[PDB]
Every structure is written in structure tokens, then in C-alpha cells.
């Protein structure tokens, strides 16, 4: 008897991710990670079809007010979306129209015969999955994100969307009504720290790092689910 | 074998909403939409039970220092729940008493024998449930919602909680610790929007629309549940 | 046939708690309550995995900018942590180092053989379970907090992480990326309050209570598992 | 008698042009500023001051700068808010753009005192006088603050004349955004000091909704004064 | 010639101050810090004549929206004033109508001859004026304060706003627009520390301090103004 | 002729004491404070004021007090922003501390004027004229806010001397905390008035993302000016 498990999954490329083994696909789409209206920040989570929509816009939403008047793309609104490993212009300067295309992450909504799970090593190792639970894929610990207004949202930690497959310093693009979408010196990914058992309780050693050693301090995580 | 998969319902009226097909009743109660205490927000999941309680209050909670006090209804703190299509007083001064009641949406939650799901077309049309789930209800796409200070919270796109069977552009009303509800100018509802498949990438084209045009760009939504 | 269904359980204390009747140990780890970076705070639902990590630490995360350099324990964001007992040190003065130990509950991740719930009375008498329901465990209505910035996190009402098993008016503990803990002044727990169904819409009666009288006002709850 | 350059700052709330008041003499015209928001964080320039007057107005009057030595402007989602006149939203109720802004734009003018300028306020409907050695440069409503996009937004010294607007409006200020748009919102809030009677201090506060033709029997009155010299 | 330079005196008790030596009275009022609408803090420099209002009220504003509708005392804004030596009730309840009188404090605006200044030492000693300007009066060193929402305002350092003649942890009380008023956990007071020279570019030594010990840490200050 | 204190604040941005303008006196010294962050909430100082120049630095220059009357001086996790040098990073990007954090902290002088000071400023790449009657003191950028941690932050008078820098920066202040460390974030951001041609006013602005080497093109200038007597 298959209940209507639900997993969700992100390539983090243009390209559509396969359903993990033992799935199989419903839908899939663009990677919707949050809206911004009026300021406020609302977030979907990573492992849920919440976060899945099959159409893009970097304006999905519209306002209405007690007045009974709605209005769409028509003050200071955001929308935020998983991105590619696209490079920013040479410019720096906002992205606009079919250009946007090759920034913009794909997701699977995937239908699943049991509940699924992520799991965190908080170390460098990959966490094995709890005994009687398979591996769906394996990735990074990533807890929350802010950008404009230091606005942001995060992931549930059991939840698959805790787990990226990809490490990105700069996993998201931020996108306006106006129809622009850039990169911004404010965007800032959170991500579980590795840490040594002996250590927990004693003060944390401060660490900069810079690209070539970024993964030296990542929480690894392993996503599952319950063997039927 | 019933697992006990849950969905909660909305009635955005004063009368309880009947258990969708396939599924069975738990209990009633009035919509919780969200609760604001030292100026900070936190909503429910409008498809959970937890947006749905036994008893209404214009003030549900209380809270506690670490000198072992506890205070209730004594600061400036609120409460938010749907609302029904009762209009405002003519005055437009806050509501009291057993005037409050008429204003109040209704609730079920309800035991389903599968796992249940919400898709949106991000369109005029409606989305179909996926191959091998039957469908439970269909509306709108609700996505968030502020008020006072703008703070607010919002629903997951994969819950029953984003797709309100009603449309409303004032879905929700404000309460206070001291007793008093009303609609406040600044009470703001957000929704999906509708985007055609060629124009995704393009700049959105802003619009403001008034009563009779409303919905002609709210994106439609389905909740779903798996055959078993 | 097990489908992975997942409670997790906190002590408030040292010790780690038992899996609830009917229900088996996955892993046992320490209560995440929130974390905060870049001042914003992000909460993890206290019913589900992702508040429970294998190993502590005052700062259990890391944050990455887009010019692809990583910060560990290198500005001042915050982790917080449901607490046991244990008073303030006289002094008042920050805690460090193993002397943190003894203030850190602890938690048990358990996998079910069906779906878990709260209800909650939003009185003082304990809320029965729905019919074919069994009982997990019994507490009081914990729905948000505060410290902070008055930032903070919530509990979703339909999840068991609504339903603490004793009653803390300083339910959390607060620490630093530069290894402190403490309680702070500002820290507030927040609670369902007791309503009376005759006084549902009438004017709350402000009350403030002091110890020997918290409870007194203070909703009810029961934790249930579907019965298979 | 020295001129030793003492300013007051005043703001028609219309099209056209402020005259500086008696006794002061004129430096030059602008545009009424009330505030920025930019990254989300409102600024606010006090009302009474020479910085809520700028020589040309933009719906974007700034730009951001990053510590990559990289700058944008009108790049982003940021905001302007100008105070406004008397005239009304387009039936369309749609974003303003363009030469169609200039009709919602106050002005004000930037004026020299020989002392000293302040504000007094009565929390009644009457006139407050000025204090004994002061004379009168204006009446009008005490302004204390405002918000709009994000509940974010600034407000006025008490002691400013910027505290003391001469026209009462229920929506004194016009949202502009680095797109191009201006329009007002319905989270748009307007904050004036009330009306109380020595009598009802240390009293529980009276509600009251009020509609038009009856908005100001609950708005403070003020007056803008100069020390005589 | 008098040009007609201000400033503005608390006495932070029931008695009106005295204007210091060498000014001359205006008029008399009660204290304002700050104000609190629609969750946004606006505060007034304490030493202007903004802060000195000739009537109290625990609502001295009300708001108007863009519907030409005005609300007075009817949502859930605040107020705030600087407070008495009068101590918070055993009850520790919130104060209504006449009670609140022996909290407010009282405060003079007055005409000065010349400029006026504050200068602050960040040492436990009095800072001289500098040459060619005489004493109005000392104190300590007050920058900032938060409550509600960790809203707040401060002073100016420049500003004898800043020089506040009595130290006191709690300076200021919180007010509502339904009519109550308190002390609340979450109040906070920010001071000038002391700082010495040779440890300007040093870590600073973590301090708890306790009632008997709170001035050691506290700088203090001189408002003075210039002899004509 | 009568001297009644009016203050003027100027800031170096270097480790070298700024000079007081022609026509003023010294009246301290100290270094350059911009703001402090406390329980998350940011408070500024306006940087034409005597507040803004703290005659001793500290990474944690205040404390917090509760209503329980116990203090804690940098037990938390508290900020303070000062106006910063043109030191870079080290190459580390890690933590500054100690000693090491002197090169980087802006000098600033209090000086008594004989008569009111002002900014104006051209909203264009050329110098505004001083008002007639007003003599030059100095001429500069003109600065309107910031941001850093959390996106809070502060901003400037733009009738104050503050509102005016010496120096463009892209990166015009630092970040402390009551740990005992400084550094830029990637997260800091300066605000400027941008230049507005007088025919675009009512335009939609044409965005525009700039480079080192052409940052300031769309700047605006400033003079701080002061009434001859
Ligand atoms: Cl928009
Ligand atoms: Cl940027
Ligand atoms: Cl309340
Ligand atoms: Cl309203
Ligand atoms: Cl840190
Ligand atoms: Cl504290
Ligand atoms: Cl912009
Ligand atoms: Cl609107
Ligand atoms: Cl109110
Ligand atoms: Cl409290
Ligand atoms: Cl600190
Ligand atoms: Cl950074």
C-alpha cells in the first residue's frame, strides 16, 4: 500500500533532477526558497513540493487590501529562488528577461512508499543512515539564509531540504517585481558547522576560511528512508 | 490500516465545515491564523490541527519572565483568526462581546486514511491532482498575510492551508488583549499569482485591479489526497 | 509494516528521556530550541529530528558570503537551547566552558508505527485523546518565545513539540559564538492560556501570577498516537 | 545686531512655493523630503531642518555602495517618500510615473532667522500661545510620526517647527519607489498628537473613530515661534 | 541679545526642576521618551523641548490612515516617559488612572543665554567643561533604551539628554493606549562605560555588576554652557 | 563680538588629528564614533555633533542595565560602527584585534564656531555654492545612511556638517563587538546622495551598477558652509 509519501528534491542546475531509487515522479519545476512582501520574509521548506512550482516569475505573488483592491507587481516586492553555478555579468549589473533562465535552480516533486529523512554528522564524514532506513543521496547541512533587510527564512533539519547536494556559498538569487534578479554583497547562506565530540561544550576556535578549504567546516548529511 | 494522516478545513463562515470526501471528523473549532506577543509573529499552518482550537479568545496565550512571573492580557499583544463575509460596522470603531462572534471562521479537523497535498496552476485553471490521488477541495492560492507592524506568517505550498476555498482580499481579522477586533487599513493578503508559460522570464506587466477583477490573476489550487 | 514515522521527545533535564509506549530509539542528542545569525532567528519545531542534535555546541553553525569566504564563531549570532533545572550561578555572570553541561536538556528521536498529535484543552483539565488514539504523554500548551532583539520561534499546535512535560517559566537558555551562556532578562516564554467556553468573547480578565499560581492559567495537553 | 544664521525650514504642502515668514529671509527653494528606505531601514530628515529640502527631487535621490568598490543605483527595491499635496489618487488607484508625479510633489522653502525658532503644542483644538519675548511665525498640527512599506518609517523633534504642519492631512506623504513609481499605499499611517484635558491626564483614554468633517476635533494644535530680538 | 537657545531639564521625580543657573523658565510638563505606533519607536532628544509635555496621557497621539479615517486609542500602541524613585507594586499588576501620577517624571524648558552641551568623561569621575564654558549641572552618561519589541531610541552624546542627574537601572516606564502602565522584564537601559586610556585597544574584561556596585562601570558627565 | 558656542565636529578618516576649519577653535580631540548596536537595536550619532567624537575608543563603549538592577558590560553580544581608514583588510579577512585595531579607527576634533554651520549640497559632480552670506569651511561627499549587522544602522542630517564626508569610501566605517573584535562584513553598506540632471527629475532613474574607477561619477558633492559675521 503506497500512502503518498512526498519527497522533494533540487538539481541546483537547469537540468531536471531524477526521482532518488525507489521513488517516482509526480511533477517538476522551478525552486522557489522565499517571497519577500511588504518586507516580510516567508520561506518554503527545501524537502517539501511547497518549494516546487512549475512556473517562474520574479513576481509569483500579488497584494490585496481591505479596500478590495489588489495590486501586482506594483511597489518593492522579492522573490528568491536556488540557483545555478551561472556566473554573474562581468557588469555586476541586474539580470533581466530570457537571461534569467540559466540562473534559475529545477526541482522533482517525487512520491515516496515510506517517510523519508535527513540525518547530520555535524563532521566531515557522511552521517550513516538510522538502521533500517536507506540512502536517497548525500550533501550539505543547511540550516538558513538572509538577504535584503537581513530578511531571510531556513530549513527544518529532518527535512531533505536540510540536505543540498551541492555546497554553494551563494546557493540563491534574489529577484524584484520590477523583473530584475541579481547576486548581493548582503546574501548569506548558513550551513552546520563541523564539530569535534571532545570540544561541544569548550569555547569555539574562530575561523576564516577561503575557497579551496570552505568544506573543512561543513556539517555533512545523508538523506533516507524506511526500508518496506 | 489507518495511520492517522490529518487535514484541518476552513469554513471562512460562522457554520462548521463538513469532512471532504474520504475523510472523517475529529473535532471543530474556531481558525487560527496567527499570534503576535512582544511585537513578534507566529502562525500556524492552516492545514494542521494547530490552526484549529475548541475555544476562541481575543487572547489565547500568556507569557512568563525568568523571575517567575506570568502575566495574561496585561501588555499589548494580539491575536488573529479568519474571518467570515460579515462586513464592517458602519462607525468602523472595534468590535466587542458577542459582536465578535459573527466575525469568526469555523473548522474541522479530519482523519484521512492517506497522505494529502496541495498543487497550484499559477493560472486561471485549475491544477489537476496528480495520477493516483482524488481530490479533496479546490480554491485559491494563499501564500501570506501581514498586520500590524508588518508582521505576519504564511502557509506551505504543498499544505492544504495555501488553497482557500473562499477568495477574500481582507481573509482575516485583528484581536487584542484588551478585548477589542477590527479590520485595520494596513492588513495585507497575498496570493499566487497568474503567469503565462511564454512570459516567465519576461518583466511582469503591473496591474492594479478592483471588485469584479479580483480574481481574473489569483492562481487556482487543488487539494489532493493518494487511493489507497 | 513500519513506514518510519518519527516523535521526538525532550527531558528538560541531563538525562536522556525514554521513546514514548509504543514507539522505538533511533538516537539520542541535545535540544536545539533556535539559532540566530545576522540577527535574524530561525526555530526548529521541537516535535520533529531537527530539534535534536547528536552534539552540542555555543555556536553549531557557520555563515558563507558570495565572494566565497566562511565565518565560524567570527561575529555575534547566537544558538539557544531548551534548559533542565539548574539555577543562575549567584554571580549572575556568563557560563563557560564544561560548566554549560549541566544546564543543556536532552532528547530522543523515536520512530512510530503511525502519525503522532497534540490536542490541547486551553483549560486546566487534561484534553483527552481523539478516539482511536493512544496516549504518549501529558503537559502544558507551549506555543512561542523570545529573547534577544525580540526575536524568536514558535511551535506548530497540532505538533508534540506544543506539549512540554513540565512547565519552566525560563523554558531556554541563550549562548554566543564566543562560548557564553546565560539567562537574560528579556527571555520570555509564551503559553496557552485557560478559557472559559461561557467567556469565549467577553473582555479577558488581565491576571499576574506569581509562583505557587503560574499553572493556574496555563492550557493542557496530550500527546497521541494513531492506534494500529 | 549680528545675523548669525539661525534657519527654519517650511513646507507648502502644494505646488507651488512657501514664502519664508516675517522676519526671515529666503536662501532657496526645493523639494520636501521626509525620508528614505533603502535595504529595508528607514531615514528621516526633521521637517523643521534643511535637509527635508532638496533642490531636485528623484523617486530615487541616493545610491548604495558595497565593500567590493561597487556601487548601484536604482538597482535594488528601494524607496523615497516626499510630502504631498492635495491632490487626489488617479481613479486607476495604479502607480504614478513620470511628469504625473509633479502634481503630488509639496515644496518648501529654506529661510534665514535672526534667533532662535521653536515649536509649542497645546494637546487641545485652541492655539497654543507662544512663550512670553517669542512672536508668531505659524499655526498648524502637531506632526509627531509615520510609517509606511514594512511598518518602517521616522518622525519629528516636538520642539521643531517640522512638528508643526500648517495643512492637517489624514495622508500628508507620497510613497516613491527607485523604479520609477509613486503611490500611496493603505498601510500609509499619519501620527499626530491628540487632544487632552488637564482633567482626563491620569484617566483611562476615551476610543474614538473618527470620520471626515470631524477628523480634527481630536488633533493637538501648535505654533511655529521666534525670539524677538 | 537673547537668541533664544533652549534647554530642557528632568528631575526624574513628582517636583518640577529647577532651571540652572544662569536661564530662565519657560514653562513646566511631564517627561516623554519615546512613542510606539503601529510596532515603530519614535524617540524625542531629552534635552529639547519635545520631551517636555505640558499634559500627560498613556495615549497622546492617535493615527490616520489614507481612507481620511482617525483612530484615537484604539489598537495597541504605546508610550513612554521617564520614571520616579516610586517602586513597582508587590502585586507587580499594571497601574491605572491616578496611580500612575507618582511614577512620571516632571521636567522644565528654559531660555538660555548661549549654546549648551554635554561632555562625558567614560571614567567614574566628573568631566571638566571645556575653557570658556561654565556648569549647569552632572550625571550620567545615558545613550539608549529598548523595550516592546526591542524598539528603543537614544540620545545625543552632545545633548544634555544624554546627562541624566540620577543613575537609575530602570529610568523610564511603559504605557499603553488602553490605559495601563508597567515595568516590564524585557526594559532595558544603555549607559557610557568606563574606559581607560592605556585599555582603549584592549578586549574588554566582562563585568556582572549588582545593586552596591552599578556606578563603578558607569561613565559620568557635565552639562555646560558658554560664558557670554 | 559675542561668542555663544556654536559647535562644529569634523572627521579626518585617518589616524592623524583633522584640523579645526579657518575661523574655529579647538576645543578636544577624541575618535570617530558612527553607532552602537545593543540588544540588536541600532542608536547613531550625527557626525556634524560633538556625540559622534568619544575622546576614548573601546570596541564596547557601553553597558546594559535590566530592571532587576544588575548591569553587564560586555557579557552579551553588542556592536559599535566607527568611521575607518584607509587600511585594508588583512589577507586573512579574519577578526582584527587588539593594538592591531588602531589603523583603522577615524580621528575627529570638536571645534567652537562664531556662528551657525551648514551642509548644502548640488546633487551633481560639481561643488554647491555656500549661500550668500556664508563662507566656505569644507567641501566633500555628500553621506546619507548606512547598514551593517542585521541590516540595521543610522544616518545623517543632510543640513549637518555630517552629512558631508572629506573622503569618498565605499567602505567609510568598521564593525566592533564586545568580544573584543573588528571587521568589514560583507553585509555593510553606504548610502550617498546620487546626481540628478535637473531635466530627469520626474524620469524614471536609469539604473546604473559602477566600478572602481568610476564610482563617484554619480556622487553628489557638498560644501559645509558658516555664516560670515
Ligand atoms: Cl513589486
Ligand atoms: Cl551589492
Ligand atoms: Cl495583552
Ligand atoms: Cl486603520
Ligand atoms: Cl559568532
Ligand atoms: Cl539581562
Ligand atoms: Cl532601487
Ligand atoms: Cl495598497
Ligand atoms: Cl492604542
Ligand atoms: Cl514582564
Ligand atoms: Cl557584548
Ligand atoms: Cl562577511
Not at 197 to 211: D, I, N, Q, V
Amino acid at each position: 500500500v503506497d500512502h503518498g509519501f512526498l519527497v522533494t528534491r533540487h538539481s541546483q542546475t537547469i537540468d531536471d533532477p531524477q526521482c532518488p531509487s525507489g521513488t517516482k515522479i509526480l511533477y517538476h519545476g522551478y525552486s522557489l526558497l522565499y517571497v519577500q512582501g511588504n518586507e516580510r520574509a516567508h520561506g518554503q521548506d527545501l524537502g517539501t513540493a511547497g518549494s516546487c512550482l512549475r512556473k517562474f516569475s520574479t513576481m509569483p505573488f500579488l497584494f490585496c487590501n481591505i479596500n478590495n483592491v489588489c495590486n501586482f507587481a506594483s511597489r518593492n516586492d522579492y522573490s528568491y529562488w536556488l540557483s545555478t553555478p551561472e556566473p554573474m555579468p562581468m557588469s555586476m549589473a541586474p539580470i533581466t528577461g530570457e537571461n534569467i533562465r540559466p540562473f534559475i535552480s529545477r526541482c522533482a516533486v517525487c512520491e515516496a512508499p515510506a517517510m523519508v529523512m535527513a540525518v547530520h554528522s555535524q563532521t566531515i564524514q557522511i552521517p550513516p543512515c538510522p538502521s533500517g532506513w536507506s540512502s536517497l543521496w548525500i550533501g550539505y547541512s543547511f540550516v538558513m539564509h538572509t538577504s535584503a533587510g537581513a530578511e531571510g527564512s531556513g530549513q527544518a533539519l529532518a527535512s531533505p531540504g536540510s540536505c543540498l547536494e551541492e555546497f554553494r556559498s551563494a546557493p540563491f538569487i534574489e529577484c524584484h517585481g520590477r523583473g530584475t534578479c541579481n547576486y548581493y554583497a548582503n546574501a548569506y547562506s548558513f550551513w552546520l558547522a563541523t564539530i569535534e565530540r571532545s570540544e561541544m561544550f569548550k569555547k569555539p576556535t574562530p575561523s576564516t576560511l577561503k575557497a579551496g578549504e570552505l568544506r573543512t567546516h561543513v556539517s555533512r548529511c545523508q538523506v533516507c528512508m524506511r526500508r518496506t
